[PDB]
């Protein structure tokens, strides 16, 4: 009967008023369920559901809106919170009575459960309302705003408010998002921007970064406490931009990165490093500003003053590297980008100087007489610098020249020290370079062996000191001056020459007299042990013939290049050693035997690259590179008959960059020369493509 269900519905609905209101008694739950149970069975359960929704809405409109409006003046949040708690309480208890409808009709009608329905009504009549929502949103904005200023606020109320919105959101959080979440984010955004603008007045980097880090912690706390995590994640992004992104480069130059670089403020740089580590391209702007400075400082070091001491030049760059290395180790926490930045910076200014290899060849000074470990680290640093240099071949040539000098003078602290340097060169170079240095050592082993063999020969047949030099390995004057040698030493050398001819067949003895000295004696008032070049030796031999000998006169008889006969200027040097002009050397200058020269020790050694030398040495480097690439091109041209010009120059430069960077324009000239010399043959389809012609 429809009138029966109507009357039983009224009884149930009247009891529903009780379940909804604070007072909850005066009725037997079983009757209430029976009412709902029978109504659903009588096809009136959905009718009850609509009636329940009606009274739920009525309560949230008449018994709620007015109550929270009375609190618009004060305690609106608390009154709204209390109403929300009461509403949720009413929803669950009426649900626990009208559960059968949810058990069958609600899921059947595919509608929401009593509690779900109640919450939807609340987020439409109370929360998320035309004005009530705004009142809650603004008071929460005011709450967090005071919290931002530090004003002690009831974070519990803010937390309850935002949490209540989440519950109203149910499955989703759109309610909170469209209520306080979005307002909070934009309000906090301008809060940081004002803070950063206030900081712009301080113009000090360190305190800016410190308090900014504190702001991040304090602000993120205010959120995870009463604003949960849904608003925290956006904040981590918002605060980072509204406070740092705007000053990504401003903070770098505001103390400042360069200020930290000047005062080596690793601790302050570490904070700035972290500050921009969490900023996209934050390290980038710091790196480029740092590189800008490193560029300036290193170019200042590279820039020559007079010319500057090669040792000081290299050590200055080594000191520059150490400073930024410590900065990366601590401030930049071994950042790979920062490493690459410093590495490229050094490779840049270092090559600007073409004397860098000559200056580094520093290594010779270290090898020419700290503890062995400290020296090792010094050599390693110079090797790290050698790595920055692209002129590997130039350094090798300069070093091998210095190595040969030390090897001939056998004055190296220890061959093991050289071996170590040679081994390190092998690691950072080709076996070809190493073989040259290795061959020099082999030569020394032969020299000392052959020398004793000659002495044994002298004993067998019943103080000449010939030092045989391996051809190639040891660089020698293109043209040996071939000057006359004192008879006794010369005769003795002839004996070693005939000895070497027999000992080593198919091997001559091109004497580099210019190389090597002797224990020459000289009248000094008594004699002395004078270490003079073979050239100066023959000069004194002429002094034996004639005490008064003129510059040109000595040349006419010694057969020494006028320039090298150097020897006479050095020998005179400044008339203590010999009386010539004091130092200036000229033909009109006659040399008189000097006995004034003296020394506490009977042994007195006699003093014996410049623009000319450096020039020819670099030209030799260029000529070597020329033939080098020419061969490389032909080699690969032979390997791959067809090679397009651009492809050819690309693979050639790539396979040669290891020791030097070949200039493509000159490569093309040498390539054109190879085209002329058969080999490369321009194809009709593409002249750039070259076909190999044996």
């Amino acid at each position: 009967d429809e009138k029966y269900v109507n009357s039983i519905w009224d009884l149930l609905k009247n009891a529903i008023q009780e379940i909804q209101r604070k007072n909850n008694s005066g009725l037997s739950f079983e009757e209430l369920y029976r009412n709902a149970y029978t109504m659903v069975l009588h096809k009136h359960g959905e009718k009850l559901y609509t009636g329940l929704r009606e009274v739920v809405t009525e309560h949230l409109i008449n018994k709620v809106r007015e109550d929270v409006l009375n609190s618009l003046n004060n305690n609106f949040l608390q009154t709204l919170n209390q109403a929300w708690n009461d509403h949720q309480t009413a929803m669950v208890m009426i649900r626990d009575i009208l559960m059968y409808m949810d058990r069958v009709y609600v899921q059947q009608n595919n509608v929401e459960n009593v509690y779900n329905l109640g919450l939807i009504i609340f987020r439409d009549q109370v929360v998320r309302y035309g004005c009530i929502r705004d009142h809650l949103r603004q008071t929460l904005l005011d709450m967090i705003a005071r919290e931002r200023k530090g004003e002690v606020v009831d974070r519990g109320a803010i937390r309850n408010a935002c949490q209540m919105l989440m519950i109203l959101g149910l499955e989703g959080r759109s309610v909170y998002e469209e209520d306080f979440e979005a307002p909070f984010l934009e309000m906090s955004a301008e809060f940081f921007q004002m803070e950063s603008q206030k900081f712009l007045a301080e113009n000090s980097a360190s305190v800016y970064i410190k308090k900014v880090e504190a702001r991040i912690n304090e602000e993120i706390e205010r959120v995870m406490h009463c604003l949960d995590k849904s608003t925290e994640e956006p904040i981590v992004k918002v605060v980072e931009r509204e406070l740092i992104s705007k000053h990504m480069k401003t903070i770098v130059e505001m103390s400042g990165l360069v200020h930290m670089l000047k005062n080596g403020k690793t601790e302050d740089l570490g904070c700035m490093y972290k500050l921009f580590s969490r900023v996209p391209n934050g390290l980038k702007t710091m790196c480029e500003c740092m590189s800008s400075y490193l560029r300036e400082q290193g170019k200042a070091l590279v820039s020559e003053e007079g010319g500057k001491n090669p040792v000081d030049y290299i050590q200055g760059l080594l000191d520059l590297k150490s400073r930024f290395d410590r900065f990366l180790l601590e401030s930049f926490n071994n950042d790979r980008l920062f490493k690459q930045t410093i590495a490229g910076d050094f490779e840049y200014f270092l090559n600007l100087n073409s004397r860098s290899p000559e200056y580094l060849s520093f290594i010779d000074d270290k090898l020419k007489k700290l503890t062995e470990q400290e020296v090792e680290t010094i050599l390693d640093k110079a090797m790290v610098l050698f790595r920055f240099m692209q002129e590997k071949d130039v350094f090798e040539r300069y070093y091998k020249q210095h190595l040969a000098r030390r090897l001939l003078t056998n004055k190296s602290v220890s061959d093991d020290s050289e071996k170590n340097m040679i081994s390190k060169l092998k690691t950072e170079c080709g076996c070809q370079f190493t073989s040259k240095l290795e061959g020099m050592f082999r030569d020394m082993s032969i020299s000392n062996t052959t020398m004793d063999e000659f002495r044994q020969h002298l004993q067998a047949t019943g103080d000449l000191t010939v030092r045989v030099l391996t051809t190639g390995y040891w660089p020698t004057q293109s043209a040996t001056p071939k000057c006359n040698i004192p008879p006794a030493p010369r005769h003795a050398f002839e004996i070693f020459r005939r000895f070497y001819l027999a000992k080593h067949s198919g091997r001559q003895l091109t004497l580099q007299h210019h190389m090597g000295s002797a224990d020459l004696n000289a009248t000094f008032y008594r004699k002395h042990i004078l270490q003079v070049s073979t050239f100066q030796m023959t000069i004194l031999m002429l002094f034996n013939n004639r005490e008064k000998y003129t510059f040109e006169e000595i040349q006419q008889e010694t057969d020494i290049p006028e320039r090298e006969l150097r020897a006479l200027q050095s020998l005179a040097c400044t008339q203590r050693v010999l009386t010539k002009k004091s130092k200036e050397i000229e033909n009109g200058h006659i040399f008189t035997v000097n006995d004034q020269f003296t020394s506490k020790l009977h042994r007195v050694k006699i003093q014996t690259e410049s623009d000319p030398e450096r020039k020819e040495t670099r030209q030799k480097v260029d000529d070597d590179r020329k033939h080098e690439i020419e061969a490389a091109i032909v080699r690969i041209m032979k390997s791959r008959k067809k090679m397009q010009h651009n492809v050819l120059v690309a693979e050639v430069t790539q396979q040669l960059k290891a020791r030097f960077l070949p200039s493509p324009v000159v490569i093309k000239k040498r390539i054109e020369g190879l085209i002329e010399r058969e080999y490369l043959a321009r194809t009709p389809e593409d002249r750039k493509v070259y076909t190999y012609v044996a």
């Binding site: 030092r467 051809t471 198919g506 091997r507 580099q512 000295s517 002797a518 004696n521 031999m541």
Partner: protein, 39 residues
Amino acid sequence: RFEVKKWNAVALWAWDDLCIECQASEECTVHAFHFQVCP
């Protein structure tokens, strides 16, 4: 007066190198030709 003693003669000995084949190995060594019967 000025008689040379203990003369440190330095003579660069020279052939009195890898053949084109080897040049273009080091282990390989030299009708004398660097690297079944003598030609």
